[PDB]
């Protein structure tokens, strides 16, 4: 899209997957895994599969990690695809940069289960952390795309049910509006190689299972954001989801939340996945690390 061989290669990988033939839900899941999950973890990364209050999950951490600091992470994929298979490498880089443990959730996906299952799962995982003696002031929630919206919905839900809120939230290209009403869905239509309004609406239909698309916990564009901890919002300048990120930040600030928006010029959706081969990916991951160190450290 822009002029650096690194970015060209990435935009290329993206435009390729987008044009690979697929027939089924699991084809789409597998293709994502092929695109984003084909590189190994560094040899020094430790992982463990476990259940947290019934939710399948994975500890991910690098040497030197503070075992009392937890980044509870909610992967993207439109609430339909994605998993630790697509995300664990990116998460291992964030873990190292922040010097903390990541707890990655393989939360329930649509169409098998609809909204609000992922909110339920995030609440369950958080309650598990608390029950096991982790301190809210040392926990942050993070996520990308659907998972970025889920961070906000889960924080609101936690407040609504009286759980002690964590120290921070990190939202990477967050999806906060099921109806894709953002003007960037038009403005960046020709610029965004991976996300467009039609696809967003399709995934929304699958996730919602017939429920109201403006439901605050599906579309936190409509949620009460008061009381939330500081948020870091990153998004790419060519994204159709750009206005989702802008709206989240604006609405959060209006509700008295310490929210900060970073728009990274020329970057595609969740460009951080491509940190191994993209400078801006590593730079954004370092920034997340600094934010986490300032909030849960």
Q: Which residue has the tokens 């959730």?
A: 105
Domain CATH code at residue 134: 3.40.50.1820
Q: Residue 87 belongs to what domain range?
A: 1-297
Strands 55-61 vs 46-52: parallel, antiparallel or unpaired: antiparallel
Q: Which positions are annotated as active-site residues?
A: 145, 239, 269
How many domains is the chain partitioned into structurally?
Answer: 1
The full length of the chain comes to 297
Cα separation, 236 vs 11, in Å, equals: 13
98, 207, 192, 190: which is closest to 149 by C-alpha? 207
Strands 231-236 vs 259-264: parallel, antiparallel or unpaired: parallel
Cα separation, 225 vs 285, in Å, equals: 25
Residues 6+ apart with CB under 8 A from 34: 17
Instruction: Please report the resolution in angstroms.
Output: 1.7
Cα separation, 152 vs 145, in Å, equals: 11
């Amino acid at each position: 899209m822009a002029k650096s061989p690194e970015l060209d290669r990435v935009i290329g990988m993206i435009r390729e997957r987008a044009a690979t033939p697929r027939k089924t839900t699991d084809d789409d899941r597998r293709l994502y895994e092929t695109m984003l999950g084909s590189m190994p973890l560094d040899d020094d990364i430790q992982t463990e599969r476990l259940g947290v209050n019934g939710v399948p999950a994975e500890w991910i951490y690098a040497p030197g990690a503070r075992d009392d600091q937890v980044f509870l992470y909610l992967h993207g994929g439109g609430y339909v695809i994605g998993s630790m298979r697509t995300h664990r490498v990116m998460l291992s880089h964030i873990a190292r940069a922040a010097g903390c443990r990541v707890l990655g959730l393989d939360y329930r996906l649509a169409p098998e289960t609809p909204f609000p299952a992922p909110v339920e799962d995030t609440v369950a995982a958080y309650r598990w952390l608390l029950a096991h003696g982790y301190d809210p002031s040392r926990i942050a929630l993070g996520g990308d795309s659907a998972g970025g919206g889920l961070v906000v919905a889960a924080l609101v839900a936690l407040r609504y049910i009286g759980e002690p809120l964590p120290a921070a939230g990190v939202c990477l290209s967050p999806w906060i509006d099921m109806e894709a009403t953002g003007e960037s869905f038009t403005t960046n239509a020709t610029m965004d190689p991976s996300v467009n309004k039609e696809r967003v609406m399709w995934f929304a239909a699958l996730y919602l299972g017939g429920k109201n698309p403006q439901a605050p916990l599906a579309s936190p564009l409509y949620a009460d954001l008061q009381g939330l901890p500081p948020l870091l919002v990153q998004v790419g300048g060519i994204e159709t989801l750009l206005d989702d990120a802008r709206a989240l930040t604006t609405r959060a600030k209006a509700a008295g939340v310490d929210a900060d928006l970073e728009v990274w010029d020329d970057m595609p959706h969740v460009w951080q996945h491509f940190a191994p081969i993209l400078p801006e990916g590593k730079q954004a991951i370092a920034r997340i690390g600094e934010f986490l160190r300032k909030q849960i450290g």
